[PDB]
Structure formats: C-alpha cells, structure tokens
Design an enzyme around this catalytic site. Structure first.
Site, PDB file in Angstrom:
ATOM      1  N   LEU A  24       0.883  -1.158   0.000  1.00  0.00           N
ATOM      2  CA  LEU A  24       0.000   0.000   0.000  1.00  0.00           C
ATOM      3  C   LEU A  24       0.925   1.213   0.000  1.00  0.00           C
ATOM      4  O   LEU A  24       1.474   1.583   1.036  1.00  0.00           O
ATOM      5  CB  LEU A  24      -0.869   0.006   1.256  1.00  0.00           C
ATOM      6  N   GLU A  31      -6.510   6.000   8.655  1.00  0.00           N
ATOM      7  CA  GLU A  31      -7.293   5.254   7.678  1.00  0.00           C
ATOM      8  C   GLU A  31      -7.372   3.796   8.141  1.00  0.00           C
ATOM      9  O   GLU A  31      -8.424   3.164   8.056  1.00  0.00           O
ATOM     10  CB  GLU A  31      -6.651   5.343   6.287  1.00  0.00           C
TER      11      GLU A  31
HETATM   12  N1  LIG Z   1      -6.452  -0.393  -1.291  1.00  0.00           N
HETATM   13  C1  LIG Z   1      -7.005  -1.449  -0.700  1.00  0.00           C
HETATM   14  O1  LIG Z   1      -7.955  -1.326   0.072  1.00  0.00           O
HETATM   15  C2  LIG Z   1      -6.400  -2.866  -0.993  1.00  0.00           C
HETATM   16  C3  LIG Z   1      -7.126  -4.010  -0.587  1.00  0.00           C
HETATM   17  C4  LIG Z   1      -6.645  -5.321  -0.802  1.00  0.00           C
HETATM   18  C5  LIG Z   1      -5.426  -5.527  -1.440  1.00  0.00           C
HETATM   19  N2  LIG Z   1      -4.677  -4.399  -1.866  1.00  0.00           N
HETATM   20  C6  LIG Z   1      -3.377  -4.633  -2.554  1.00  0.00           C
HETATM   21  O2  LIG Z   1      -3.603  -5.514  -3.704  1.00  0.00           O
HETATM   22  C7  LIG Z   1      -2.365  -6.238  -3.961  1.00  0.00           C
HETATM   23  C8  LIG Z   1      -2.608  -7.742  -3.928  1.00  0.00           C
HETATM   24  O3  LIG Z   1      -3.001  -8.054  -5.268  1.00  0.00           O
HETATM   25  P1  LIG Z   1      -4.144  -9.124  -5.666  1.00  0.00           P
HETATM   26  O4  LIG Z   1      -5.227  -8.352  -6.296  1.00  0.00           O
HETATM   27  O5  LIG Z   1      -3.507 -10.191  -6.486  1.00  0.00           O
HETATM   28  O6  LIG Z   1      -4.631  -9.698  -4.269  1.00  0.00           O
HETATM   29  P2  LIG Z   1      -5.811 -10.736  -4.028  1.00  0.00           P
HETATM   30  O7  LIG Z   1      -6.834 -10.609  -5.078  1.00  0.00           O
HETATM   31  O8  LIG Z   1      -6.300 -10.549  -2.638  1.00  0.00           O
HETATM   32  O9  LIG Z   1      -5.186 -12.196  -4.036  1.00  0.00           O
HETATM   33  C9  LIG Z   1      -5.298 -13.018  -5.192  1.00  0.00           C
HETATM   34  C10 LIG Z   1      -4.771 -14.317  -4.763  1.00  0.00           C
HETATM   35  O10 LIG Z   1      -5.796 -14.624  -3.758  1.00  0.00           O
HETATM   36  C11 LIG Z   1      -6.560 -15.802  -4.135  1.00  0.00           C
HETATM   37  N3  LIG Z   1      -7.883 -15.440  -4.816  1.00  0.00           N
HETATM   38  C12 LIG Z   1      -8.443 -14.199  -4.952  1.00  0.00           C
HETATM   39  N4  LIG Z   1      -9.623 -14.234  -5.594  1.00  0.00           N
HETATM   40  C13 LIG Z   1      -9.792 -15.514  -5.849  1.00  0.00           C
HETATM   41  C14 LIG Z   1     -10.905 -16.065  -6.513  1.00  0.00           C
HETATM   42  N5  LIG Z   1     -11.888 -15.275  -6.935  1.00  0.00           N
HETATM   43  N6  LIG Z   1     -10.921 -17.426  -6.693  1.00  0.00           N
HETATM   44  C15 LIG Z   1      -9.896 -18.196  -6.246  1.00  0.00           C
HETATM   45  N7  LIG Z   1      -8.829 -17.661  -5.610  1.00  0.00           N
HETATM   46  C16 LIG Z   1      -8.738 -16.313  -5.388  1.00  0.00           C
HETATM   47  C17 LIG Z   1      -5.585 -16.538  -4.971  1.00  0.00           C
HETATM   48  O11 LIG Z   1      -5.132 -17.890  -4.616  1.00  0.00           O
HETATM   49  P3  LIG Z   1      -3.869 -18.634  -5.238  1.00  0.00           P
HETATM   50  O12 LIG Z   1      -2.605 -17.897  -4.970  1.00  0.00           O
HETATM   51  O13 LIG Z   1      -3.774 -19.980  -4.622  1.00  0.00           O
HETATM   52  O14 LIG Z   1      -4.127 -18.743  -6.705  1.00  0.00           O
HETATM   53  C18 LIG Z   1      -4.782 -15.464  -5.785  1.00  0.00           C
HETATM   54  O15 LIG Z   1      -3.467 -15.865  -6.263  1.00  0.00           O
HETATM   55  C19 LIG Z   1      -1.388  -5.740  -2.871  1.00  0.00           C
HETATM   56  O16 LIG Z   1      -0.596  -4.600  -3.330  1.00  0.00           O
HETATM   57  C20 LIG Z   1      -2.298  -5.338  -1.735  1.00  0.00           C
HETATM   58  O17 LIG Z   1      -1.701  -4.560  -0.692  1.00  0.00           O
HETATM   59  C21 LIG Z   1      -5.156  -3.066  -1.645  1.00  0.00           C
HETATM   60  C1  LIG Z   2      -5.929  -0.253   4.240  1.00  0.00           C
HETATM   61  C2  LIG Z   2      -7.124  -0.484   3.940  1.00  0.00           C
HETATM   62  N1  LIG Z   2      -8.077   0.492   4.130  1.00  0.00           N
HETATM   63  C3  LIG Z   2      -9.466   0.358   3.831  1.00  0.00           C
HETATM   64  N2  LIG Z   2     -10.221   1.344   4.058  1.00  0.00           N
HETATM   65  N3  LIG Z   2      -9.894  -0.781   3.333  1.00  0.00           N
HETATM   66  C4  LIG Z   2      -8.975  -1.863   3.103  1.00  0.00           C
HETATM   67  N4  LIG Z   2      -9.446  -3.046   2.600  1.00  0.00           N
HETATM   68  C5  LIG Z   2      -8.388  -3.769   2.533  1.00  0.00           C
HETATM   69  C6  LIG Z   2      -7.225  -3.241   2.925  1.00  0.00           C
HETATM   70  C7  LIG Z   2      -5.900  -3.992   2.896  1.00  0.00           C
HETATM   71  C8  LIG Z   2      -4.654  -3.854   3.790  1.00  0.00           C
HETATM   72  C9  LIG Z   2      -4.531  -3.992   5.313  1.00  0.00           C
HETATM   73  C10 LIG Z   2      -5.622  -4.289   6.103  1.00  0.00           C
HETATM   74  C11 LIG Z   2      -5.397  -4.364   7.532  1.00  0.00           C
HETATM   75  C12 LIG Z   2      -4.082  -4.139   8.139  1.00  0.00           C
HETATM   76  C13 LIG Z   2      -3.859  -4.200   9.529  1.00  0.00           C
HETATM   77  O1  LIG Z   2      -2.821  -4.562  10.047  1.00  0.00           O
HETATM   78  N5  LIG Z   2      -4.829  -3.918  10.274  1.00  0.00           N
HETATM   79  C14 LIG Z   2      -4.895  -4.007  11.732  1.00  0.00           C
HETATM   80  C15 LIG Z   2      -4.606  -2.557  12.202  1.00  0.00           C
HETATM   81  C16 LIG Z   2      -3.296  -2.422  13.087  1.00  0.00           C
HETATM   82  C17 LIG Z   2      -3.294  -0.920  13.394  1.00  0.00           C
HETATM   83  O2  LIG Z   2      -4.285  -0.340  14.121  1.00  0.00           O
HETATM   84  O3  LIG Z   2      -2.159  -0.481  12.825  1.00  0.00           O
HETATM   85  C18 LIG Z   2      -6.332  -4.365  12.172  1.00  0.00           C
HETATM   86  O4  LIG Z   2      -6.487  -4.797  13.335  1.00  0.00           O
HETATM   87  O5  LIG Z   2      -7.310  -4.243  11.405  1.00  0.00           O
HETATM   88  C19 LIG Z   2      -3.025  -3.854   7.278  1.00  0.00           C
HETATM   89  C20 LIG Z   2      -3.214  -3.779   5.913  1.00  0.00           C
HETATM   90  C21 LIG Z   2      -7.627  -1.794   3.372  1.00  0.00           C
END
Ligand SMILES: NC(=O)c1ccc[n+]([C@@H]2O[C@H](COP(=O)([O-])OP(=O)(O)OC[C@H]3O[C@@H](n4cnc5c(N)ncnc54)[C@H](OP(=O)(O)O)[C@@H]3O)[C@@H](O)[C@H]2O)c1
Ligand SMILES: Cc1nc(N)nc2[nH]cc(CCc3ccc(C(=O)N[C@@H](CCC(=O)O)C(=O)O)cc3)c12
Length: 205
Positions: A24, A31
C-alpha cells in the site's frame, strides 16, 4: 450458500488504484484505524456472541504485517484455490467466495457458540472482481484518496463513474455513521500529505 449481504471495504485513489509492488503506497494511520473500527464493530446487544467476518485473497493475506495476522476479534478466511497447508491456530481457508460462505454458514449457526454478524470482503483485485459479480454484494465502504499515486493494481469496476450511476448510489454521511455506529470524520482528512475521504455506496439487489 448465502443469506446475509456482503460488504466490500477498500481504500482507492481517484484513478481506482489500490496497490503497488504488493503493498500500500501510502501510510495512513487514521485510515487503518477506521478500517479496524468498521470491520470490528457489532451492535452492543449482539456484542456477546456475534462477530464479523473478513474475507481476503492470499496475496492480501501476505500483505498484512505478521504482527497483525490474524485480524484480532474477527473471523478471518483466506480464499485460495491452492492449498499450501497453512492455517495458523484458526484461519479458515476457502476455494472460492461462495465456498467460503457455505463453510461459514456450516461452521457456525445453531450448534455454534459464536455467531456471525457482518461479512466484509477486504480485498485483492481478484477477490474484488468476484465480489462485484456476486448477487449479495450491495455495499461498498470506500476511502477515496485524492492523489494520483502510482499503482499497478486497480479496482475492477468504476463504480463512482457516470456509467454506473444508475446502479451505485452514494449514501448521505449521516447514514454512513449510522450503519457504522460511531460518528465518522466528515469531509477531507489530511495525513502525511494525503487528502482522503470516507464514502459509503449502495446497490439495490
Ligand atoms: N487499497 C485497498 O484497500 C487494498 C485491498 C486489498 C489488497 N490491496 C493490494 O492488492 C495487492 C494484492 O493483489 P491481488 O489483487 O492479487 O490480491 P488478491 O486478489 O487478494 O489475491 C489473489 C490471490 O488470492 C486468491 N484469490 C483471490 N480471488 C480468488 C478467486 N476469486 N478465486 C480463487 N482464488 C482467489 C488466490 O489464490 P492462489 O494464490 O492460490 O491462486 C490469488 O493468487 C497488494 O498490493 C495489496 O496490498 C489493496
Ligand atoms: C488499508 C485499507 N483500508 C481500507 N479502508 N480498506 C482496506 N481493505 C483492505 C485493505 C488492505 C490492507 C490492510 C488491512 C489491515 C491491516 C492491519 O494490520 N490492520 C490491523 C490494524 C493495526 C493498526 O491499528 O495499525 C487491524 O487490526 O485491522 C493492514 C493492511 C484496506
């Protein structure tokens, strides 16, 4: 397989970016505090037995500091079509979103001492895609980050854009606080050179 509505919680830039290099690209302590408070909140009366669920993809599971895995006070379930024999003293694993729902509804319920309150899909662009296609997803808790930060992973559906404006509606702030319980900050918040905002969007099922 499903009774209760699904809620998706995400932090994204105005460009729908949600991550970079598996992390992230933004450190927002407040947040994350909001994320914790929302994903954990359960009504007072039902505070005894009830408990919320957070579903996440594997890669999102890895992205959580070992110091914080699992998310305390919440039922964690990692969706993954490939078993890698890692549970860690609780953590449920599911082949798919619907598979995860039936596992929960099975694991819990009548013969269960612990009940389920709300189910949150917390992430992964892949799991977000599946969830956006699920007939029970009717709510998005979005944190809008007003800055075109560089990302390589994006949210699959442009729900804030005009093309989806007849389906996804932005809720009043008072309704956000209501659904969420406590009063939440209104308007843009500044923290570390980032200005962000809390929004709640709903869909009619
Ligand atoms: N801004 C936000 O709120 C937020 C939230 C979440 C994540 N992120 C970011 O997103 C990135 C992670 O990327 P990503 O999109 O690849 O993560 P992801 O979608 O959570 O993970 C995908 C992996 O999870 C499993 N998976 C997800 N959906 C699946 C489905 N529909 N069916 C079967 N298996 C499934 C898999 O298993 P296998 O490995 O076994 O194939 C796959 O390789 C990171 O940079 C993370 O920090 C940001
Ligand atoms: C960051 C973030 N913000 C929002 N609004 N939605 C989201 N949906 C999914 C994520 C992904 C990342 C993510 C989620 C939880 C922790 C985490 O450690 N959470 C602890 C908080 C510890 C703290 O207070 O620092 C938790 O208990 O939820 C870290 C990264 C995310």
């Amino acid at each position: 397989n499903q009774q209760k509505s699904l809620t998706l919680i995400v932090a994204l830039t105005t460009s729908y970016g949600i991550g970079r290099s598996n992390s992230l690209p933004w450190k927002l302590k407040k947040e994350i505090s909001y994320f914790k408070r929302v994903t954990s909140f359960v009504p007072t009366f039902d505070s005894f037995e009830s408990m919320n669920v957070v579903l996440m993809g594997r890669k999102t599971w890895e992205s959580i500091p070992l110091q914080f895995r699992p998310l305390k006070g919440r039922i964690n379930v990692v969706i993954t079509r490939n078993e890698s024999l890692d549970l860690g003293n609780g953590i449920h694993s599911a082949k798919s979103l619907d598979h995860a729902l039936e596992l929960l509804y099975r694991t819990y319920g009548s013969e269960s001492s612990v009940q389920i309150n709300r189910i949150f899909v917390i992430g992964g662009a892949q799991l977000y895609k599946a969830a956006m296609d699920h007939p029970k997803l009717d709510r998005i808790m979005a944190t809008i980050i007003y800055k075109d930060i560089h990302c390589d992973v994006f949210f699959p559906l442009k729900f804030r854009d005009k093309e989806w404006s007849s389906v996804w509606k932005k809720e009043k702030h008072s309704d956000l606080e209501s659904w969420v319980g406590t009063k939440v900050p209104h308007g843009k918040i500044n923290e570390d050179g980032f200005d962000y905002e809390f929004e709640m969007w709903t869909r009619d099922l």
